[PDB]
């Protein structure tokens, strides 16, 4: 939930002592290969594909079959099998994965992961109206709060395809809605921040970026770039050095540590 897979995986590796709680533990160590919390990153000037996952499919199919109890064939489990399948990540193989999933997503054309994988396949192959349709029929079911984080993921996925359409503020309010069902939405934070940047609001955008850095596990270099960029343009002279500290906690080798902030550092400090 807070994006700490190391200690979590160490916990889950010692969960292999029960047939059901260990079963959902193993289901979770194979679910984290494509969905730790949420994945809606198809914003404008953004894209998502993992060609390095030719070994992630191998370990996904290996640790896949190790699920205990009755978990070796579920809709979630077979969709996770097809998660490894498009994680094979070749274009014709992605099409084959999409067809295998279409044998799975058409089984439940109201569930979030099936039509979500529709959306991911349709957007790494660029047919974004098809992804729009699949995510609109994600929420074809009425409001039942059982996949609220996954509902937020699908809402932001529709939101970023709408960004690709051309309108901005809709995805800003949907990413604000993302804060409701989880308090650690770093990708949403960066996204809303970029959107308000389009609508001329930058200090709040930088606050969202540094919240994202807080929940991206010390990762703000380009996020740190737009952090310091928004911290700089308001001409608040002593500022943009808290973001200096934030991005050197992100990366000690942060490369923009003397141009967007040294127009504030030493150009300020009781200015």
């Amino acid at each position: 939930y807070i994006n700490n897979p190391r200690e979590a995986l160490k916990e889950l590796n010692l969960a292999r002592k029960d047939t059901r709680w260990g079963s959902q533990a193993i289901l979770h160590m194979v679910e984290i290969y494509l969905n730790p919390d949420n994945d809606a990153v198809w914003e404008e000037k953004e894209n998502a594909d993992t060609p390095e996952s030719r070994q992630a499919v191998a370990t996904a199919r290996s640790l896949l079959k190790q699920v205990r109890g009755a978990d070796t064939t579920t809709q979630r489990y077979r969709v996770l099998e097809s998660y490894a399948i498009m994680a094979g990540k070749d274009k014709n193989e992605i099409e084959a994965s999409l067809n295998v999933l279409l044998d799975l997503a058409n089984q439940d054309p109201n569930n979030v992961p099936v039509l979500l994988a529709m959306a991911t396949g349709f957007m790494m192959l660029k047919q974004t109206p098809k992804a729009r349709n699949q995510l609109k029929r994600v929420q074809k079911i009425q409001y039942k709060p059982d996949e609220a984080e996954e509902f937020e993921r699908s809402w932001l996925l529709l939101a970023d395809i709408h960004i690709q359409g051309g309108k901005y503020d809709l995805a800003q309010d949907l990413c604000q809605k993302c804060l409701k069902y989880n308090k650690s939405c770093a990708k949403a934070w960066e996204i809303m921040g970029q959107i308000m940047e389009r609508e001329q609001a930058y200090k709040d955008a930088a606050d969202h970026y540094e919240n994202a850095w807080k929940h991206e596990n010390q990762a703000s270099a380009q996020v740190g770039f737009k952090l310091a960029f928004n911290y700089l343009k308001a001409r608040r002279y002593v500022e943009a050095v808290d973001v200096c500290h934030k991005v050197i906690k992100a990366f000690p080798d942060y490369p923009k540590i003397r141009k967007e902030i040294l127009e504030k550092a030493r150009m300020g400090l009781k200015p």
Binding site: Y237, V238, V241, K270, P271
Partner: protein, 338 residues
């Protein structure tokens, strides 16, 4: 110790300005703490905190304020290329437009000769003039301060050098602070030769007239936005990106946590000849703090072990009264004598 909060107040907001306590200057007795917050001169009292005067004379946010060292006026320097001068009655008398946005302010002790460092010049404001007696320095005058006698005005320049000048702006010294320019210098109103060359790198430079240090140039754990001498140079109030103010002995050894605040203390200034400190934050929250020093002591009926210099203990063996302190160089909590 105890560092009691004398008062603490979030400043009022008006004219739609960023609520930041940009600069802090004191009436020389320490009664009116004059905080230039936003585009206001939010004049408080440094014993109560009540807003005596909200002085909205500037156009842009007031970058800097400075009280008269002889105690007659307090001006206000902002980014609007002007300085509006307010008397001790907090009334705008003069508003003279410079050639660049104001960087810092300092007043003469001899007269009300305000110096107003702009981005390219220093606006020497004589006690009643409308003119800008500029100091055209090739480097940007980043810090100014007037020596307590009232003759020298150290124009710290944006080159790593504090160029100490006169009341006409003639370069005399080439203070070797290093590569970092020093936006925060301050002549102590009792020390004409101790320049507190506080920088962003953390180095606590207590520099002399020509550019040599007084004590060890301590590297702070935080980037200091303002460093000032508590108790007329015996103790140090350091304030920076640590969100608060620390107390340090003038060696540079830690004493106590002075302030407990919300944001960046942009300016720290001890209340002159008091126990209080001007802790005005990035949220504008201005707060005095009772830095009361109790003589913590043990006693085996003869060696009165009262703590003095607050890292040392001046134990006076009352039979002999030999006041040779113990150089602990670290903050003393409790003492007992056998």
């Amino acid at each position: 110790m105890r560092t009691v909060v004398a008062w603490q107040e979030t400043p009022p907001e008006k004219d739609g300005v960023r609520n930041v306590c940009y600069d802090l200057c004191f009436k020389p007795d320490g009664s009116q703490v004059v905080a230039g917050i936003g585009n206001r001169v939010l004049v408080y009292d440094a014993a109560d905190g009540d807003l005596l005067h909200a002085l909205k004379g500037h156009k842009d946010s007031i970058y800097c304020v400075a009280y008269a060292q002889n105690g007659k006026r307090f001006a206000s320097g902002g980014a609007d290329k002007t300085v509006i001068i307010w008397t001790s009655k907090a009334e705008g008398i003069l508003k003279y437009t410079h050639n660049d946005a104001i960087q810092c302010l300092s007043y003469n002790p001899v007269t009300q000769q305000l110096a107003s460092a702009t981005g390219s010049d220093v606006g020497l404001w004589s006690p009643e003039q409308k003119s800008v007696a500029k100091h055209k320095v090739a480097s940007r005058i980043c810090s100014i301060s007037w020596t307590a006698d009232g003759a020298y005005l150290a124009l710290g320049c944006f080159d790593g050098v504090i160029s100490i000048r006169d009341k006409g702006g003639s370069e005399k010294h080439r203070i070797e602070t290093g590569p970092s320019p020093v936006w925060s210098i301050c002549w102590n109103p009792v020390e004409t030769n101790v320049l507190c060359a506080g920088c962003f790198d953390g180095v606590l430079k207590f520099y002399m007239m020509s550019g040599q240090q007084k004590s060890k140039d301590r590297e702070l754990a935080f980037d200091p936005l303002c460093v000032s001498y508590f108790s007329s140079g015996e103790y140090i109030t350091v304030s920076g990106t640590d969100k608060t103010v620390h107390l340090y002995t003038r060696d540079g050894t830690y004493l106590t946590k002075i302030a407990d605040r919300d944001s960046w203390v942009w300016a720290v200034r001890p209340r002159p000849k008091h126990n209080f400190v001007a802790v005005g934050t990035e949220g504008g929250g201005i707060a005095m703090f009772q830095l009361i020093f109790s003589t913590v002591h043990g006693l085996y009926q003869d060696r009165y072990a009262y703590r003095d210099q607050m890292t040392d203990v001046i134990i006076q063996h009352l039979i002999t009264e030999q006041k040779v302190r113990i150089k602990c160089k670290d903050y003393v909590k409790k003492i007992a004598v056998y």
